[PDB]
Amino acid sequence: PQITLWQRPLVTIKIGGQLKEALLDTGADDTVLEEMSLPGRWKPKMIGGIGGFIKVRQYDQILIEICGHKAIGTVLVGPTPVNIIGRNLLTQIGCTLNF
Amino acid sequence: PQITLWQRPLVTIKIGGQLKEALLDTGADDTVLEEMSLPGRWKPKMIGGIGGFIKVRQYDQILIEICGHKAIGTVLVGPTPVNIIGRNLLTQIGCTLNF
Ligand SMILES: CC(C)CN(CCNCCN(CC(C)C)S(=O)(=O)c1ccc(N)cc1)S(=O)(=O)c1ccc(N)cc1
Ligand SMILES: [Cl-]
Numbered sequence: 001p002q003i004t005l006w007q008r009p010l011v012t013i014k015i016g017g018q019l020k021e022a023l024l025d026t027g028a029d030d031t032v033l034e035e036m037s038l039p040g041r042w043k044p045k046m047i048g049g050i051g052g053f054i055k056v057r058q059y060d061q062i063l064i065e066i067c068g069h070k071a072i073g074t075v076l077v078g079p080t081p082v083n084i085i086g087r088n089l090l091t092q093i094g095c096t097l098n099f
Numbered sequence: 100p101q102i103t104l105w106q107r108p109l110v111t112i113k114i115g116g117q118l119k120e121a122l123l124d125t126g127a128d129d130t131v132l133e134e135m136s137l138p139g140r141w142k143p144k145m146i147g148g149i150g151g152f153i154k155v156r157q158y159d160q161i162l163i164e165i166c167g168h169k170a171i172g173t174v175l176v177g178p179t180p181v182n183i184i185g186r187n188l189l190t191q192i193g194c195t196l197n198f
């Protein structure tokens with residue numbers, strides 16, 4: 001599709017059998033979601049910027065569906081104020097910026 | 100242009116006669132720049148970041164060029180990790196997300 005930026009570009013994702021709303025964020029290196037369970041190994045990470053840093057758990061090789069697009073990648077999990085889809089997954093669905 | 104996301108979408112902007120590098124950030128509602136001098140009066144604004152809310156300076160109707168595309172809009176100034184171009188100016192230059 002073609003997504004306008006007049007409004008926040010929010011999309012439905014499916015992960016861990018869960019449906020969630022998330023922000024497509026070209027400025028985010030990696031996907032980070034609010035607290036949830038994910039299977040497999042993880043390692044701690046600090047991510048931050050405006051207003052500071054937050055501690056997250058990094059899970060790798062996680063399956064996700066974005067707008068019906070299937071993709072695999074890293075998912076960070078922690079106290080983000082909003083669910084964000086980062087470049088690491090945006091590239092796999094072939095998402096680009098255009099003007 | 101068409102910008103893929105395998106690397107950060109960092110572009111050149113021009114503001115106050117000076118070139119700067121900035122991040123095209125669809126996750127950002129508003130544009131926020133590193134501390135700099137701008138003309139006119141400013142008003143206070145609180146923005147919600149990944150680690151918390153912070154105070155920044157709002158300057159309105161400022162000339163800024165993004166990848167050569169001319170714009171005039173609101174620019175916020177404050178302690179941001181990088182210059183960020185948000186949806187207020189992305190919309191202005193006709194930017195969309197596509198997949
Ligand atoms: C400086 C940016 C490159 C840092 N980030 C990415 C840009 N997101 C842009 C949206 N933001 C809020 C976020 C909670 C949705 S923001 O705090 O940067 C913000 C707020 C207000 C305005 N006007 C401009 C920017 S990050 O969010 O810190 C981040 C860092 C690591 C990962 N893995 C994921 C997100
Ligand atoms: Cl103030």
Ligand SMILES: [Cl-]
Nearest residue numbers: 172173187188
């Ligand atoms: Cl504006």
